[PDB]
Every structure is written in C-alpha cells, then in structure tokens.
Symmetry: C2
Subunit: 416 residues, 2 copies
C-alpha cells in the first residue's frame, strides 16, 4: 500500500496549492454526476441489501443499509450545501502587531493525508470525499465489508469526476479488499497518513489504539442519557423521548438510558409505559422501577449491570430512578461515553448546573439528543462525531480538518 | 502511582468548577511567595549549577541551567503577567440560531489532567504550574535529573500556596525519582491523564511515541532554516543572522542551516565570513561554498550528510548554496523539522511563494527565527512549542490547554 501513500502525498501537495474555484467546480461536477447515475447506484445498493438480508441482519441495520432515491437526492443536496460554504483555507484566524514591530497573524492550512475507516453506510463515502476535496486533503477510505458494490460505484463516480476536472488522480482513493490485515497495515503506515478517523464500535477502536502510530481522532460509541427532572411537562418530555428513541434507532446519538427523578416517577412512569407500548419499545427497568412499570402495557424486563455500558441499537431503553441531580450527574459521569446528554426540566438553576457540571461533546436543555449531527449543527456535513478531547470535538466540519500556521512579517527585526 | 492519578482527577473536577477570582488570588500569592523566598531558590540553583559544572557540562547547557536574580524576577513578572490575562474558561467561541429553533453555542472548558515531562530548566516548572492553575487543569510534572533541588523547592512553594489558599492539594504534583521506569508507568496510565507534553530530544519523543497510549503533543527538536534570496541588503541580513545565531544558541528556535542563493553567494559569503568570525562561529560549509569560505577568517570545515538533520546547540552553522527558491523549498521540506523558517528578500513574489509553499509552525519574512516564543507572540507564557499538526501548533498559550463543548437550548425541540 506504499504506492497508495506516495500517490496520496503527491496529490495532497497539489491540492493544498489549489484555488477555491477548482474545488467548487469539482464538487459541482460530482453532484451532477451523482444525480445522473442514480440508476446504477440504486441497483447496486438494492442488490447489496438483498444479499445482506440473506444473513438475517437486524431491521435497523437494513434501514441503515437501505438507499432510496430520496436519500440519494439528500446526499446530493448535502454535497451542494458543502459547495455553497465558504472555503476555510487561507482564512485569517487572528493577528496583530507586536511590541517589536512584527506583524503577526494565523492562517488556516490543510492537514495533509487523511485516512478514514467507517461503518457500513453508503452516504458516508460521499460526505467524506466532498469534505476532503473542499478542504484540500487527500483521502484514503476503508469502508465496511457489506457496502462493497455501493462504495465501488460511488468511488468510481468520484474518481471519474476528479479525472475529468483535471485534479490529480491520487486525491481520493479507497481500499476494496475487506481483509483486516490491510487495516493493520494502514494503521502502521505512519510516514504518509497525517491523521486517521476510525468510526465504529469497541473492537475497532481497541485494535486501532493498540496498534496505531498515526494521530487518531476516535469516533467512539455513543451512550446518550436523558435526565427527567421533577418539574417537567409530561407530554412534551414523552414526545422528546419518543423522538430521541424511535426515529432511526440504529444511529449513535439515539438515547440509551433514561434517568427519572424519584419524586416524579409516581406519575411519569405509567404514562411512559403507555407510550412505549405504542412504539413497541422494550423497557430494561431497574429493581425500583420494576414495580411501577409492571402494570404498564409495554413489556418490561429486569436490567443487568453490563447493559448500562453498551448500545442496544434497537427498540430498547434503560429506565433508572435516581435521587437528585447529583446522583444523575454521577451516573452520567461514571457510565457515559461523552457523546450527548440532555436534560428535561423547568428549573433554571437545574439546567445551569447540568450544563456546567456535565462534560460531553453536546449538552441539550429541553431538546432531543438526535441533534448531534453535522448537517443539523449548521455545518454542511460531517465526517465523524469526535468524542475525544484533542483537536475537534462533537461534529467535525470543514474547520475540523484544517490546522493553522503563524506568519510574521517584519523589517529585518531583531529580538531584544 | 495510581493514587497520584486519583488525586489529580479529584482536584481537576473542583478546579474546573472554580472561578477566576480564586485562581487569580492563588497566582498572586504564588508570585509574592516566590519573590519573598528568593534566597532559597538562588542557593539551590547555584548549588545545582556547581554540581553540574563539576561534571563538565557544556557552557550553553550551564547557561540554560543557571538562574540569576534577574531571571527569577523575570519569571515572577511572567507569573504576574499571566495573572493579569483574561481567563479563557467560559468564553463563547461562536453560536447562532438553527433552522429548527435550537440555540446553539460553543463554550471553552478545561482539558482535565495534564502530564508534563520537560528538560532541565528551572522556570518551566513555575510556568507550567501557573498556566495549569489559571486554565483549571491539574498537572503532574516530571523534570530532568539535573534540576532536582530547584524543582523540589519550587514545588514545595506551590504546594504550600495551594494549601494556604484552600485549593485541593492534588492539583499540582511532581515526581522526584529520576528512574525512567516511573516515566514508562506514567506513559501507560491512559484512563487517568488526558494529555501529555514531552519536551526534549529525539530519544525522549521516540520512547514516548513507542509505548504511549495517551494523546501526545510532541515538543520536538528544532532545525530552523534561513533562506537568503538573490536581492537583499547585506548588512541587514548579516545582523538578523547574527541575532538568530549568537544570542542564546542553546534554545530550540536557533537557526542551524543557512541557504544562500548562488547568484548572491559571490558577494554575500565573504562578508559573512568577516562577520561570523567576530562571533567565533564555526562554519560547516558545503562543497560549493568551501572554496569561497576558505579565504575568510572564519573557521570552515566540510559538512557531513547527517549534520543537516541534527542541531548543533552551539556556535556552529551550516552553509549550503542552492539554485533558486524551488531548490530551497525542496531542501526545507526534505530536511526540516517544521519548527521555524525565515526568508530574507526584497521581492514580493518570492516572499508570497515562500509563505504559501513552506509548511512550518512559523514562517518569517525579513525577520529572525528567535521570535518563536510564547512571550514574544503576545501570549503570557508557553508550556512548549508544538511541531505537530493536531490540536495546537507553534507556541502553546492559555487557549491551547482548553477544549470546547457544544451547548444547545430548545423548547422541547424535535428533529424533523
Ligand atoms: N462516534 C461516531 O461518530 C459514530 C458514527 C457512526 C457509527 N458509530 C458506531 O458504529 C457502531 C456500529 O458500527 P457497525 O455496525 O459498522 O459495526 P462495528 O463493528 O462497530 O464496525 C467496525 C468497522 O471497522 C471494521 N472492523 C470491525 N472489527 C474490526 C477489527 N477487529 N479490525 C479491523 N477492522 C474492524 C468493520 O468492517 P469489518 O467488520 O468488515 O472489518 C467496520 O467498518 C455503533 O456502536 C455506533 O455507536 C459511531
Ligand atoms: N520543541 C520544543 O518546544 C523544545 C523546547 C525545549 C527544548 N527542546 C529540545 O530540547 C533538546 C535538549 O534537551 P535536553 O538538553 O534536556 O536533553 P534531552 O536528552 O533532549 O532531554 C530529555 C528529557 O527527557 C528525559 N529523558 C531523556 N531520555 C529519557 C528516556 N530514555 N526516558 C525517559 N525520559 C528521558 C531527560 O531527563 P533524564 O535524562 O534524567 O531522563 C530530560 O528531561 C534540544 O534538542 C531542543 O530542541 C525543544
């Protein structure tokens, strides 16, 4: 794969030296070509979905795999939105004049070569390629073993567009082979890749962090908690919970654990049990909440200790009764994965304390956890939702793929 | 060492929850106590310098280790200057109102627990402790074997101040044993320290990147190049080079390789030889410049292939004659460590090309490479100069020790 690395570096130099007009032109060509070849991509994705259904995959997994024409138009519109955004290369962050007469400033520059290891989702290839082209980085992709044909067709379209627009061919490339030995080799390829973005579960992150030399921005799994305070509207809270759970339960920002204040559980729990039975969501309750949730129509089973630290990725929910805000904060800190946290309350003090004392990539007050998305947050699209602390955090947009450089212009200045 | 980490985390929570007034009070008390107890620090540093010189340490190394009363007053003034800076915690980076009615914003927050492994330099301890206190981080320091008594006294003073002002004693900790097994043990504590700052030569960074599981911001070694164009003022270039080389040659932002355009080399080289000899600097010339530099009084020796990639850390310079700007850029890319580069020229186009095409943490036009400092760049003080690309680059100020967090407020908002 060393030839891939050298090609990526050679293309990255020229990309960093490009102008905004050429990048916008290539993005427009990519979007137009995506719209033109809808039939091929749709047929390949349908065939792949039919193949995956033979293995008895989960309904949520199939929904993630599925690609309707509406979704294709959505990804095309996202590419166009990225095109309409301002180019973040060359922008001045700040500047000034020092005491010695030196004119100093900070200017944004690209990062170099970016490696991406993503899950089985079709659109992610498009978004990553568009963001990397707009910013000025060469990208090496390694997708999941399921979406082989869809990723093949999409990367073929992207590379055809790159060739037609005159950009170097090594700007964007992908690894077709699904063997994980090549994944290890990519991880060891330190002299070429400048930064690696793994998206996936615990196993991929474990293996990567074990055997990585490149800087890593871990996508991380998401255990998102929702805290229900004593003073809250029942109907609105139920609507928010239903939206945060039912809609697309296969994502990573879907709520997984529900923390209910003990002074409200006498009234909130029964209604919830009525609502979940409508959506068919199984309730993994604690011992304290089991007695109240037993009479509810919705099916309820006792929870286990290890279930608090993993994602259900289905129509399941953890119900726990806490004593006060301090207990909820302690539980979130202990079991949370620092992805997204929400509080439903009517107290200004409680909302302020929750916002202050909870460390996460995103904290919401009277809102659903499903807002942790690149498109929703105002950015054109996202490459991954970083849960670490270094470099970017939360959704990673155009500015998350760029670094900065100090430039100082003087007149034969000498440091005193 | 685990108890050290537990104390660090427990102190980090409370420190992140503090206010600006308390941190400023602690810093002012620290500076006052440093000025009050100058005698003990001076005695310890003098004894350490005597012991080091008894081992035949280099003159530049001894100058780095030496701490005069003027230097002590300077570090006290820098601590006070930091105390006078604005607290970066809580600042709003940006924000807005989204389409769905959700008010989004970004707020700065402390990183957490910070581990520092640094060279033998007395002032770095105080600077790191002050910055970590001001930001709201807990710090674990592990200094060089030389600075033992000085670091012991300074850490005693800081711990006493923290105890007196009521802050938890676990905020600032240091390791006294110079064994490197403890260094490895600190390296292996991933879940407890949040970010590591190693300062040192290639050996320390190699060992850290070999067996580290914590995010690392490498200080890195510094090979700083200066390119002399065809048309330039001889006297001004000479004085800038003299300032960049002679003054404090033991630092890391000192010029090592001098690139001279062949068109000007017929006249620039002799004058340089007349000046450099007055400074007593040996010239490790290349083959092309060997004939011209021989007549000059300055000492000249043939350069070796490996000398281009290592710092002299003394009064030594590398003279290489290049063809044009493209050759200089290629050489800088090949051999540079991406620390600080400068160009002395009278052409606007050449300056623009050099600024655009050279990838370094700092690029200067008609200036010196000695400006790559935390204090010079307007920041109060720096913990290290980062030569990597992730997180901060160049000097690391107050904001380099803080990350950000998304906050979203809504009225039971639902994602559409
Ligand atoms: N944090 C974020 O921004 C974000 C975004 C999207 C998804 N996610 C997470 O994605 C997870 C589900 O992803 P998934 O359904 O695709 O399953 P997964 O097992 O998490 O996917 C792992 C990814 O890496 C590969 N992989 C798996 N095991 C590997 C190993 N041992 N060595 C090398 N590569 C390996 C997989 O392809 P192969 O199996 O073919 O090797 C796949 O591309 C959820 O937990 C969710 O939280 C997070
Ligand atoms: N990039 C920057 O911002 C920056 C700033 C300052 C200095 N520097 C660099 O500092 C260098 C000189 O530093 P120096 O004179 O102190 O020498 P050094 O050998 O670079 O110092 C290494 C530092 O780490 C320790 N260390 C050395 N070998 C180690 C090992 N195998 N395992 C663990 N710890 C180890 C040393 O103390 P022990 O030997 O007792 O272990 C010392 O604290 C220059 O090359 C300069 O460029 C860079």
């Amino acid at each position: 794969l060393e030839q891939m690395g050298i090609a990526a570096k050679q293309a990255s130099y020229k990309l960093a030296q490009l102008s905004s007009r050429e990048k916008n032109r290539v993005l427009e060509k990519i979007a137009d070509e995506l719209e033109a070849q809808s039939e091929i991509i749709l047929n390949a994705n349908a065939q792949d979905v039919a193949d995956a259904r033979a293995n008895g995959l989960s309904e949520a997994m199939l929904d993630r795999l599925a690609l309707t024409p509406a979704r294709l138009k959505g990804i095309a519109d996202d590419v166009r939105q990225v095109c309409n955004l301002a180019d973040p290369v060359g922008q001045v962050i700040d500047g000034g004049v020092l005491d010695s007469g030196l004119r100093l400033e900070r200017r944004r520059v690209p990062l170099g070569v970016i490696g991406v290891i993503y899950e089985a989702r079709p659109n992610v290839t498009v978004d990553v390629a568009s963001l990397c082209l707009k910013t000025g980085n060469a990208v090496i992709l390694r997708g999941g073993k399921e979406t082989c044909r869809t990723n093949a067709a999409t990367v073929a379209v992207i590379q055809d567009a790159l060739k037609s627009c005159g950009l170097p061919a090594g700007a964007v490339q992908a690894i077709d082979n699904p063997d994980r030995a090549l994944v290890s080799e990519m991880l060891r390829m330190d002299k070429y890749i400048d930064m690696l973005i793994p998206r996936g579960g615990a196993g991929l992150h474990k293996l990567c962090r074990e055997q990585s030399t490149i800087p890593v921005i871990t996508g991380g799994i998401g255990v998102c908690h929702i805290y229900v305070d004593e003073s809250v509207e029942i109907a609105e809270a139920l609507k928010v919970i239903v939206n945060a759970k039912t809609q697309r339960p296969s994502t990573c920002n879907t709520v997984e654990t529900l923390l209910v204040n003990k002074n409200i559980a006498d009234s909130f729990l029964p209604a919830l049990s009525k609502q979940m039975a409508e959506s068919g969501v199984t309730l993994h309750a604690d011992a304290a909440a089991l007695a109240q949730l037993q009479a509810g129509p919705a099916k309820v089973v006792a929870v286990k200790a290890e279930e608090y630290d993993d994602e259900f990725l289905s129509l399941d929910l953890n119900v726990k009764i806490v004593s006060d805000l301090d207990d909820a904060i302690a539980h979130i800190r202990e079991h949370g994965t620092q992805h997204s946290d929400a509080i439903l309350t009517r107290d200004m003090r409680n909302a302020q304390r929750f916002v202050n004392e909870v460390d996460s990539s995103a904290v919401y007050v009277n809102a659903s956890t499903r807002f942790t998305d690149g498109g929703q947050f105002g950015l054109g699209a996202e490459v991954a939702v970083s849960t670490q602390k270094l470099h970017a955090r939360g959704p990673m947009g155009l500015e998350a793929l760029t670094t900065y450089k100090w430039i100082g212009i003087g007149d034969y200045t000498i440091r005193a």
